[PDB]
Design a binder for this molecule. Structure first.
Ligand code: X3B
Ligand code: X3B
Ligand code: ZN
Ligand code: ZN
Ligand code: ZN
Ligand code: ZN
Lengths: 328, 328
């Protein structure tokens, strides 16, 4: 209620501080880091890289990240706890399902999925006792039949616990509209939902249609850009819009009166096995600041564009605390 | 060379004894049993069910099973070792990839996949030190581009180590023909390959085309039948051919001179989360003998049809030892 669950236990709302609401320690697949740690060099190399990156983010002002890696994105909460302790940065873990559920998940009913999400929120993840503080869901265009069940189960789990829901979208296909429709059919308040990857589109009619009915808007991939990259795989993933173009959507929604509904993040990672080999090297070339990109480069950019510091503090501190605090 | 790796260490060829070459302790997905053990009631309930089933198979004469669950079928070698110790039945574990690889596998090259398979054969699975004694691969119709890489990587891993390859097929689509073509393009001897689920078809021209060029023929789902089952999901999985019809394919290949190339098994499981809920209950209703079905019902059936006991001993003891013994 007045506590947010992290990988090291409950924290008070004021302890969260400056919070990045959509990040990843390691974007992988279930069991993959355990079965093939050499893919990342070594598990120890991955830990060290993440600790260094989180320590640099902390020096830039970050106090909490929300790791929105699910079961099928290879979430390893023991890894998150280790890196969180070493870097002195709170990490909120996720339940839910992302874009790669295995058969043992894809065959389940809405009731079964709700049981699984509630397990990870209310009891713990695996045998770790670590509880999720957010529910992550995904569509990539029109929802599959199974994805409709996932979104409904996420709504039921959030209605039982007060934990918020955050989504992956194909933003240029306006996925958030169908996601909202399904969420609302289950009775979920839009104030409990962040429609993510919304900085992937420039369509203000789509974005304000979501914000007008009360959704939080996840402008969460600000440094994702392949401008300057011959590299087909990187351009497909990162897009050809500049980080400045994405960042100006923050100002656009402020100027329309939605400052309390904006969540900002990097959607960064320290390991990334669910895409092409060496993508992490390419991404780190594009954005050497990693997760510190938001405070080091986006915040000063918005200040120079005239956004008051108080407004940016509200977006990076107040909005995440309101979102993450469990409530109906 | 003269040792077969099991989940409890190396065993001599003569220790293997009566061997079921295609079985599963638990057909699941990577990480699923760890994240949601209540799906199986409890992990302890699954262990007890498997120990009881393996003890009954041992009483019927079974000494070894080959668990052909891969990474993506949720293979948990620690579970296999626990059940193997409690039941006093050797268990050979598998590497490879089955029909549900996650993104972190599906994006890999043939070289990367070969590294992963060799890791599990030569070094160990996860951090357990348990080494795989077989490589499992799968197609379901025409091979996907990725499945072609998997079959090539399996061939390269087998060529480096002498460990055999065993396959999942859509037998009525004659998948074994393309699998053989890819294997042979990499230089793999057919004597190192079992084309599995071959009892799913009655096409003798397909089966003898594989056997004539030297492949082992996996007649591995003998008790799979939905005769007597209204139940659409079970009929889709188990088929409408009787176990006697499947078993008579053993006699057919003996009568054509291929007795040394036949491998027989149940393709049974004690847990099964990668299909519809409660499928395990339906399967256990169909075949209460479980993994003991081959010795308790198929062997006497073939004897009554005139197959000499020496021939059946060759199929159930000699052929698996020759297949599993590492060699080029
Ligand atoms: C940049 C990434 O990595 C995986 C998670 C994602 O969907 O947010 O996309
Ligand atoms: C009966 C089953 O379970 C999963 C493995 C399979 O492909 O052999 O099919
Ligand atoms: Zn995403
Ligand atoms: Zn993400
Ligand atoms: Zn199979
Ligand atoms: Zn099988």
């Amino acid at each position: 209620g007045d506590r947010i669950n992290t990988v090291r236990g409950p924290i008070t709302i004021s302890e969260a501080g400056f919070t990045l609401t959509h990040e990843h320690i390691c974007g992988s697949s279930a069991g993959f880091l355990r079965a093939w740690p050499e893919f990342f060099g070594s598990r120890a190399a991955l830990v060290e890289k993440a600790v260094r990156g989180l320590r640099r983010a902390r020096a830039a002002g970050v106090r909490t990240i929300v790791d929105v890696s699910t079961f099928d994105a290879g979430r390893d909460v023991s890894l998150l706890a280790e890196v969180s302790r070493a870097a002195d940065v709170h990490i909120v873990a996720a339940t839910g399902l992302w874009e790669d559920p295995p058969l043992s998940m894809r065959l389940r009913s809405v009731e079964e999925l709700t049981q699984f999400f509630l397990r990870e929120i209310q009891y713990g993840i695996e045998d770790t006792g670590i509880r999720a503080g957010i529910i992550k869901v995904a569509t990539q265009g029109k929802a599959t039949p199974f994805q409709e069940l996932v979104l409904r189960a996420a709504a039921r789990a959030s209605l039982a616990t007060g934990v918020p829901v955050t989504t992956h979208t194909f933003a240029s296909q306006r996925d958030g509209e169908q996601q909202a429709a399904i969420f609302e059919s289950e009775g979920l308040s839009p104030s409990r939902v962040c429609i993510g990857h919304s900085d992937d589109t420039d369509d203000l009619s789509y974005l304000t249609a979501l914000a007008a009915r009360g959704y939080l808007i996840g402008l969460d991939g600000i440094p994702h850009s392949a401008i300057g990259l011959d590299n087909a795989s990187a351009s497909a993933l990162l897009g050809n819009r500049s980080w400045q173009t994405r960042a100006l959507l923050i100002k656009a929604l402020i100027d329309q009166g939605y400052m309390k509904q904006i969540l900002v993040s990097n959607d960064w990672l320290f390991g990334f096995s669910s895409y092409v080999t060496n993508i992490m090297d390419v991404m780190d070339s594009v954005n050497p600041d990693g997760m510190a990109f938001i405070p080091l480069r986006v915040i000063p950019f918005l200040r120079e564009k005239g956004v008051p510091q108080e407004t940016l503090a509200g977006i990076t501190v107040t909005n995440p605390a309101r979102f993450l605090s469990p409530t109906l």
